[PDB]
Amino acid sequence: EIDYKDIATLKNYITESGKIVPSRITGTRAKYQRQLARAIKRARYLSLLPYTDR
Amino acid sequence: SLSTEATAKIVSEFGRDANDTGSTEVQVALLTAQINHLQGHFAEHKKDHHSRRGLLRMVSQRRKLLDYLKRKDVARYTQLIERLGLRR
């Protein structure tokens, strides 16, 4: 569901600078936000998403 | 915690019949098994006070029940403390 390989959708919760979008803006739930951020960090470590566009 | 298989084994060993989980004897057996299992975990590390707190919780309960039993059936009590090897 929230696996770290699902790049083709996990782009929407990342800004142009690699920033994570808060739930206040996204509209997502709290538990889902937590697991989504954790999966984003995991994919970022495994080199699927960039830490920064720099 | 303890494994389901070990818990069922101890329950069937110490309780009278099936589903006899509330008996003081099975309570004592489960607490003793957990304490013995955690002995090695606390031999290693020995810096985990948060878990040692739960260990002390277990120890206090066993003692409280062992007393209830000794106040009911000294017989049962003695046999139990002999089986599990305690109450020095």
């Binding site: 142009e16 600078s17 566009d53 720099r54 | -």
Partner: protein, 51 residues
């Protein structure tokens, strides 16, 4: 961070940098000594926001 403006840019007017946070992160980070401060910077204005 980067500007990719269309071929007509006039005198190179910065329209996308201005819409972006510009100095959002810059101003957020240029401050110092974030140890004893945050415990007391907390909402309570949100509370005053009421009819």
């Amino acid at each position: 961070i980067k500007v990719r403006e269309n071929e007509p840019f006039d005198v190179a007017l910065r329209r996308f940098k201005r819409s972006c946070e510009k100095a959002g992160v810059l101003a957020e980070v240029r401050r110092r000594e974030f140890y004893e401060k945050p415990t007391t910077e907390r909402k309570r204005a949100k509370a005053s926001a009421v009819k």
